[PDB]
């Protein structure tokens, strides 16, 4: 509630059917809580700052809050320990979650109401846990007291917890301890434990008692136990003899409802198919990094796991051994709900056909991860069996063709999994991504009995091939095509002719072959494209052309950043001014970076008439023209930051009927026009942050046109606040206009002691 | 002769024993010649200016010139072309070689001396040649008409020569005819030629007779007519239906002497042995860039060849196949003197050791080139037989571990031979050249039956491994040995210890492991090493160690560029201030780049005793301390230039002992000290150039000190040429120090109206 604030530098989020007042002072460099928070607020926002501590009146009048952060208040460059006065947290009775992440705490903070359900205590220096302190967390749901004691926040003693610490806390459900030094496990755990995070710890030995009562665990992590050391880029050590985690047969076996168990990094040898005799309804398991390349071949314990979902087993590769083939047990069939496999960093020579076998009978697989694997030999008809499958990887392997602040400080989530990397070539079907492997020329013969590919990823392969139409013949269903990175000659205008269900082609970074000069360079080649929608072939360095103009009936985005349009356009050659002028269904261009000192008089004639979003940024424009801008009768997004300009149009209205979004960011502007957005209604955003601007007078910036802004940004600049501005002092904090960073980027320049004041924050009585 | 010039801004060599005067004056910008030039020189170069045109009164006084140059006076941002006016030359008596390339000239220039014997008219617009303007070039011996008509200086007509036009030029031994659009080749050349450039040209057939009457000729190069254009970075017109140079069998009949012959890039199919009939003379063969795949298989004209040296069969790969192993003829035993052999682009699957059996008997063979094959497989203990090779390339192939401004601006020498890049690694012997390959771990197996290797590249393979010293086990006998571009893991004190003949170690390009922080770093891994004597390990980003020193009973060199030593140098932290100290027999030091801001006291009395060379080039000293130099009792090329020093030392005899090659090259120094260079009188080099200082005093630069002075550098810096320094001004233009540039860079900044003036030039008669 409380709507209108007064002075806050936070900004403030009403949610009235969740009844929830977000208040969010991330990065504002405050030295000290600042005053008139509202007291009907329920999260605070309180992250990395210059807090000295905190005393029990900071949250005196707070009442109904909620969540109250404090990540990252002093990162070990910063003073002493914060330090927390007694009964400091007992005034809030509503208080459910609280953060205290990287505060370089000693003990844990003592007063904390009852009905507190989360505690973070990250990356802080509390290496002993008691019964005591822990009696008044009885109510406590979620723990997190990771990341105490590692080589990045070394505390050089080992984790200490005395017997049955946690027994008492009947409400706990999920427990974090990664990366505390801890030897042995905390025994005994509370039975309605759920999530379960020990990794990255120094436990060598699990007791066969360990988890006797933990009946309704769910997720267990027991990575970074004797852990994979050999080339590894952090301070690792290796338990002794290279010995692997110990842990005994019967261990899992009061575990019943456990779905996620994590091994990575573990140096296991063997896996025992007793652990998952009683664990039958487990879905994801990784076994990553570990010396598991023998038990693949064997892989007898995949018979008692019927209904596993995902499945790792990245970098298993033997020191000192080259295999000559991927050896994959017969016991893969038994994984019928399988859905997603990684068998990464098991390096071999030479993928055959008859290798994937075992995985021919697995309805529901979609993922098939092997990259980096340097596969020498492969021959890709063997996947036209693999129909079914979504994503298949053909990494950084070395396939060629057929011969003949810290972590604490974000991401509250905290104990989170890991999420793949959602490529945007997955979304259009079957995905190949052959991407960074070795293949130097393109063959039709190849690329046999895969029609059914609708995505095909070849960024990075270095080809250097003049392609006329009869490469890609079989990829008839073909939707997406990468070709970055690569040296693509564009002698003839029927390159990639045959795919003719093509939508989205990618080819950029082949500078190559366009930095030459005196070549033919068909530009022209979109015309055979039916159905082509989007075209990125920026960083392409284009200087020349022999197509006069570029003609598609369906293109609609284009993105040409990072070229040479200023010798394309140079002044007396018009050969080139019309050269997006067929393209009939354009509507997005993203010609930037292109050097473009200025913009010769006739390009905007030559426009397509449905453009819609222009992007001018970082071009390095002198002198932009604004009268041209009345061709353009679609034009809604005009982009124009990172530029040298420095004059605003005479009158917006005059110059285009329909933008909407203006944007000059970066730029420098001394002073708008006394008729800058006279009659402009149709305007929505407008940007003039980052500027060398003085005043904005009151003809200039009508509240009528203002009324309907929905964000507006004047930060970062050289305002002067004298008493010449005394309107716009009177309508900066008298507006509902969205202006972010209104009280922490702007500031004044003058004069005098009115350096560095706050516009939102002033009043000048004397004027 | 007469030794001393006046205000002359070229350089003059005089050689006494050759009677020859060398006056250069390459990039000077001379709008005209300058006066004053001596009548005895006899070389005058007048390269790279903005000289208009060329009057008969320019060498009306010079009758000993026997060597003028006009090199790329005029490249097409240039005016009209250069004029000559008539009777321009015959004045020169004793003129024997001219050039005029780069001129824009249209016809051949009329009345040279008869005594001309070089003529150079490159990058010129003469398409017309007629025997009219030859008649005057009866007695010349050299003709350089090249690069008339081609891409980069197009004239959109053919060549033409009118018939038996070179004839009657009995002294002509070279002709060069490159890149001038010529069709046929123009019978009928003098029977006196030695060596014929006509490559790079339109012509299509060869006729029986139309090198009928060369009997002398020597050199042939036949080279871009009808070449290979597929993937040309470079405009290239192939001939029609992709037709081979027509060559008839009976063409070399009349070359009896020939001993180079070049054909690459012909698109040759087929070399009939009868053109190897007559010619048994043959040295250097070339044949790449054609389409000969076919032919190696056959090589029937290899028979005919007893005395060749060098065969070049480089980039031969057919479009679209992937050969599965390289096809070499029989024939290529009968090569009985055979040197050098390149079969690059070659691109072949697996290589074998029964396919190179016919090199098997070569015994004058030293380099084998294989490089950018594409290799696969390849068992490098096949090369046990090869011995007496002396080069062995194995580059960017995909070898992996076995499993289980113009051209004519510059180079006078015009047609050279292709001079091979002599890496350093070629002086120590056997080199196996096994750069920017597929290797990505080393075993001691697959370099077995390689003890005869003195040098090994593996640069660029990305290698991530940690070595403890087993991996070069069969490697007795290596000297060299580069590791750049790789991923070396230094966890142990033991690497590289069974390299026991190891002389020079190259480990650069590294940083990635020591880029972690927290990771040993074991630096006295030198210390097993009994015979190194270089050791580059630049570019590293080296942070950390866990050695305190480094050890070395043998080291010579140290490059330590590109690093972190101000860490490593922190204030507070004294560990690493004696890092070189244990390196007794190091004498030249190369630590710069190292974002130095300062140094320590200490780590000069920390530095080896026998130190020699020390550089601290681009490291920003903020303030460089100079009385700690006297614990470096054997310095005496210290370095620091591209530095931000500040001040000279107060003397320098009581700073250094021994120092002779001072540097300060692009610094900030305002002043001198009064005493910079009192008794100074073991100094020998002085660099104080691109600095700001302003004057020099008399008490500061002694006659005595400067007497003995080899080189003295004080141009484009902040001079000002003011009443203040007459002393100045009368000793820079009456002293012989070598001061270079001293009338083209060094520059007055004022007062007033001597902006740009020439202190050497400068006479203030007012003072
Ligand atoms: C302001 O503070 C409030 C508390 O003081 C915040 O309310 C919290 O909002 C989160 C959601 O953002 C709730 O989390 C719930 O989690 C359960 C369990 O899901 C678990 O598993 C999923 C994966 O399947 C995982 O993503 C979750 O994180 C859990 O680990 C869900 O079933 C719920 O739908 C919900 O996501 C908290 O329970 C809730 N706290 C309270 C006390 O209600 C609020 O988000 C804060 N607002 C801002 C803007 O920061
Ligand atoms: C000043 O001008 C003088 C002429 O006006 C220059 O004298 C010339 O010096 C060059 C050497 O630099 C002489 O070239 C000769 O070439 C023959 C033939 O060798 C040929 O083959 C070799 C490869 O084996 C090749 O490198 C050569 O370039 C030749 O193609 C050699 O046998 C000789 O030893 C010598 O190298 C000229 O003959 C000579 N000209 C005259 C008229 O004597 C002088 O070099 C100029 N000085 C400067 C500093 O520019
Ligand atoms: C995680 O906990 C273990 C507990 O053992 C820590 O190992 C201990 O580390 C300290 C600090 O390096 C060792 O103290 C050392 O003692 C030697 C004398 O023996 C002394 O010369 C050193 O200067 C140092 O004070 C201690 O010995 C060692 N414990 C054992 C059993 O070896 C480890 O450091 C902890 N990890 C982190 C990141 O804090
Ligand atoms: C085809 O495969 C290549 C290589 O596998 C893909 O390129 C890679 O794409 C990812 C995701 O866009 C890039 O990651 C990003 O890197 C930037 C730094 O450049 C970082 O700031 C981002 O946060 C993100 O991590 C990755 O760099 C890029 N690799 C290269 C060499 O460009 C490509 O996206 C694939 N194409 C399709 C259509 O899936
Ligand atoms: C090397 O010599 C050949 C000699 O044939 C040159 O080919 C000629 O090039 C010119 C200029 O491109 C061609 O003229 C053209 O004529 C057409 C009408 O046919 C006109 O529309 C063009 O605007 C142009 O004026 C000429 O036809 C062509 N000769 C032949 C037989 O095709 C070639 O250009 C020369 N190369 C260089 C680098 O100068
Ligand atoms: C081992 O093999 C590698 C790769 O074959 C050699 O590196 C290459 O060395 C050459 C000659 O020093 C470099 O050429 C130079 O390139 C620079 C530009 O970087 C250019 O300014 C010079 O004029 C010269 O052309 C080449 O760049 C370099 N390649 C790489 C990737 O670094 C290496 O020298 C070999 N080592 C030994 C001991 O022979
Ligand atoms: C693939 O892995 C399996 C399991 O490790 C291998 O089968 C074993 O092979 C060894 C060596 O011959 C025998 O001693 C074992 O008795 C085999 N066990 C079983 C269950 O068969 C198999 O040889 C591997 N195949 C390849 C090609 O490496
Ligand atoms: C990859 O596998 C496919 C199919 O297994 C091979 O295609 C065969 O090609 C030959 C010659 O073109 C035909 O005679 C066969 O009939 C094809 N097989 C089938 C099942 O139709 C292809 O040759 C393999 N690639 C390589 C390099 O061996
Ligand atoms: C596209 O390029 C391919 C590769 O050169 C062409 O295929 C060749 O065509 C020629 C002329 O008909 C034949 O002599 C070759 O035998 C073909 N090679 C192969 C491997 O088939 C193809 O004709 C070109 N297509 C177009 C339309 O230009
Ligand atoms: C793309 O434009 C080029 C010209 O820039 C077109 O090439 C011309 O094609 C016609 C028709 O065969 C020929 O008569 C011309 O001689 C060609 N000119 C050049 C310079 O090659 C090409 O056809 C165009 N392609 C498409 C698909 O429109
Ligand atoms: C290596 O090259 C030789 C010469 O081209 C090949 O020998 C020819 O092979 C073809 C095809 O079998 C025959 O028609 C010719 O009669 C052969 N000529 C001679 C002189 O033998 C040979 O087959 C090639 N070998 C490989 C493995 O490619
Ligand atoms: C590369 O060639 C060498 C020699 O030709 C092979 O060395 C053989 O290795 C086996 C097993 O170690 C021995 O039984 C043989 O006696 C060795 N040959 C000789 C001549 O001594 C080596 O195996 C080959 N590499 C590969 C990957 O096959
Ligand atoms: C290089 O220096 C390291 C120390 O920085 C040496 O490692 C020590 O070796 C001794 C002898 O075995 C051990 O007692 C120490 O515990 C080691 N210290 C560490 C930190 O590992 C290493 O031996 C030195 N190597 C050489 C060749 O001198
Ligand atoms: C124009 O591009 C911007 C880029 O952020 C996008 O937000 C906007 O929706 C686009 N407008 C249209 C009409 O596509
Ligand atoms: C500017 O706008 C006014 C008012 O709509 C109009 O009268 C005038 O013609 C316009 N001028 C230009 C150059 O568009
Ligand atoms: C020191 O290094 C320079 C680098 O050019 C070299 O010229 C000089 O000979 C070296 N001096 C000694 C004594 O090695
Ligand atoms: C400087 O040199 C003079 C003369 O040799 C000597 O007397 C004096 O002690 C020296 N001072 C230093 C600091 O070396």
């Given at each position: ?559 040409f950043r990072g070229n040479h349009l200023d010798v394309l356009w140079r002044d007396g050659?018009?050969?080139?001014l ?11 261009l993203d010609i930037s970076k292109n050097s473009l000192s200025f913009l010769p008089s006739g390009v905007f004639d030559g426009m397509?008439?449905?453009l819609?979003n222009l992007s001018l940024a970082k071009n390095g424009l002198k002198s932009f023209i604004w009268e041209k801008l009345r061709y353009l009768?679609?034009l809604e997004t005009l982009d124009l930051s990172h530029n040298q300009l420095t004059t605003v149009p005479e009158r917006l209205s005059n110059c285009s009927r329909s933008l909407k979004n203006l944007i000059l960011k970066n730029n420098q502007i001394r002073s708008l026009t006394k008729y800058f957005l006279q009659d402009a209604?149709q305007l929505r955003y407008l940007d003039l942050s980052s500027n060398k601007i003085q005043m904005i007078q009151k003809t200039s910036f009508p509240?009528?046109v203002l009324?309907?802004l929905?964000m507006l940004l004047l930060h970062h600049n050289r305002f002067l606040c004298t008493?010449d501005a005394?309107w716009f002092?009177?309508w900066v904090?008298?507006?509902?206009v969205?202006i972010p960073y209104?009280?922490?980027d702007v500031t004044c320049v003058g004069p ?7 516009v ?8």
């Amino acid at each position: 509630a409380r709507w209108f604030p007064k002075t806050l530098p936070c900004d403030v989020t009403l949610d009235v059917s969740k009844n929830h007042v977000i208040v969010d002072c991330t990065d504002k460099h405050l030295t000290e809580i600042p005053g008139g928070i509202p007291t009907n607020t329920t999260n605070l926002t309180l992250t990395i700052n210059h807090i000295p501590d905190i005393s029990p009146a900071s949250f005196h009048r707070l009442v109904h809050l909620v969540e109250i952060d404090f990540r990252c208040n002093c990162v070990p460059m910063c003073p002493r320990r914060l330090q927390i006065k007694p009964r400091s947290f007992s005034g809030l009775t509503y208080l459910k979650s609280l953060y205290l992440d990287g505060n370089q705490l000693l003990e844990i903070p003592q007063g904390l109401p009852p009905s507190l359900q989360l505690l973070s205590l990250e990356a802080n220096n509390i290496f002993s846990i008691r019964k005591e302190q822990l009696t008044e967390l009885a109510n406590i749901e979620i723990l997190y007291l990771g990341q105490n004691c590692y080589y990045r926040n070394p505390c050089y003693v080992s984790y200490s917890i005395e017997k049955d610490a946690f027994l008492n806390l009947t409400k706990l459900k999920v427990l974090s301890l990664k990366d505390n030094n801890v030897t042995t496990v905390p025994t005994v755990l509370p039975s309605t434990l759920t999530e379960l995070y020990l990794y990255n710890n120094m436990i060598a030995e699990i007791q066969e008692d360990d988890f006797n009562n933990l009946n309704q665990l769910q997720i267990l992590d027991l990575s970074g136990n004797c852990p994979r050391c050999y080339n590894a880029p952090f301070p690792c050590t290796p338990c002794k003899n290279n010995s692997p985690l110990q842990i005994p047969v019967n261990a899992f076996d009061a575990l019943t409802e456990l779905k996620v168990l994590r091994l990575h990094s573990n140096s296991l040898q063997h896996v025992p198919p007793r652990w998952f005799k009683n664990i039958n309804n487990l879905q994801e398991l990784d076994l990553s990094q570990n010396f598991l390349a023998k038990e693949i071949g064997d892989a007898k314990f995949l018979h008692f796991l019927p209904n596993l979902i995902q499945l790792d087993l990245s970098f298993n590769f033997e020191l000192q051994v080259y295999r000559a083939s991927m050896n994959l047990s017969q016991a893969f069939s038994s994984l019928k709900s399988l859905k997603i496999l990684r068998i990464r960093g098991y390096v071999f020579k030479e993928l055959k056909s008859f290798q994937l076998s075992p995985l021919h009978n697995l309805q529901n697989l979609e993922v098939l991860d092997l990259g980096t694997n340097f596969i020498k030999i492969a021959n890709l008809s063997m996947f036209k069996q693999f129909k079914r499958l979504k994503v298949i990887d053909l990494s950084v392997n070395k396939i060629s063709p057929s011969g003949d602040y810290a972590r604490s400080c974000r991401f509250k989530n905290k104990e989170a999994s890991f999420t793949s990397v959602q490529e945007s070539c997955y979304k259009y079907g079957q995905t190949l991504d052959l991407s960074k492997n070795s293949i130097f020329f393109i063959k039709s013969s190849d690329f046999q009995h895969l029609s059914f590919l609708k995505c095909l990823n070849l960024s990075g392969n270095l080809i250097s091939q003049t392609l006329n139409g009869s490469e890609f013949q079989p990829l008839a269903e073909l939707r997406y095509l990468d070709f970055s990175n690569n040296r693509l000659d564009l002698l003839h205008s029927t390159a990639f002719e045959e795919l003719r269900k093509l939508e989205v082609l990618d080819i950029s970074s082949n500078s190559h072959y366009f930095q030459s000069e005196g070549i033919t360079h068909m530009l022209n080649f979109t015309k055979n494209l039916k159905v082509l929608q989007k075209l990125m072939m920026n960083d392409n360095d284009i200087s020349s052309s022999t197509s006069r103009t570029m003609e598609s009936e369906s293109l609609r985005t284009l993105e040409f950043r990072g070229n040479h349009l200023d010798v394309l356009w140079r002044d007396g050659d018009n050969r080139y001014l019309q050269l997006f002028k067929n393209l009939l269904k354009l509507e997005e261009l993203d010609i930037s970076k292109n050097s473009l000192s200025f913009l010769p008089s006739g390009v905007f004639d030559g426009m397509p008439p449905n453009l819609k979003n222009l992007s001018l940024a970082k071009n390095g424009l002198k002198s932009f023209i604004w009268e041209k801008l009345r061709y353009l009768k679609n034009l809604e997004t005009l982009d124009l930051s990172h530029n040298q300009l420095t004059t605003v149009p005479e009158r917006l209205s005059n110059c285009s009927r329909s933008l909407k979004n203006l944007i000059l960011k970066n730029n420098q502007i001394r002073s708008l026009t006394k008729y800058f957005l006279q009659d402009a209604f149709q305007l929505r955003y407008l940007d003039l942050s980052s500027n060398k601007i003085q005043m904005i007078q009151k003809t200039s910036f009508p509240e009528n046109v203002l009324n309907n802004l929905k964000m507006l940004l004047l930060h970062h600049n050289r305002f002067l606040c004298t008493c010449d501005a005394v309107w716009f002092v009177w309508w900066v904090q008298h507006t509902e206009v969205t202006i972010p960073y209104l009280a922490t980027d702007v500031t004044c320049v003058g004069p005098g002691a009115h350096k560095g004041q706050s516009v939102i924050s002033l009043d000048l009585y004397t004027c």
